[PDB]
Amino acid sequence: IRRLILAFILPPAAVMNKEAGTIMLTGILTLWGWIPGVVAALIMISKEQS
């Protein structure tokens, strides 16, 4: 539960497990379309790990 909430505030912090490219993409997504687009990114990737 910590990872998903940290993600909703800090998505790239959530994808930190993923590769550096994914982390940079999630950071850019925070920069552009903050929260909705990047929250979408984090939920996709984290649910995929599941």
Binding site: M16, N17, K18, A20
Partner: protein
Amino acid sequence: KKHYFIIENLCVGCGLCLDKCPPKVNAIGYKFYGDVQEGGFRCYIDQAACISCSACFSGDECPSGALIEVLPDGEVLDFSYTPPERLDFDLRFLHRFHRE
């Protein structure tokens, strides 16, 4: 001694080594097969003209590695110093920095 050569198989005819050759020596020359864009142009060192000045090879200018140096005992050097060979792996930490 040094006896610098060029591997015609790998030369791309950039000429970055020709400019380093002393103006009067001009041992390095261009040989054309055809259709320059198809890579016909290539580099050759006229060993008779070469004076073992090392300007061509020491420049570290050959992109293809064709420009080689045969040492007096004999060993082909594609570069002044090749980087050491390494066994590499992506260090991804466990908890803090780059997990997994």
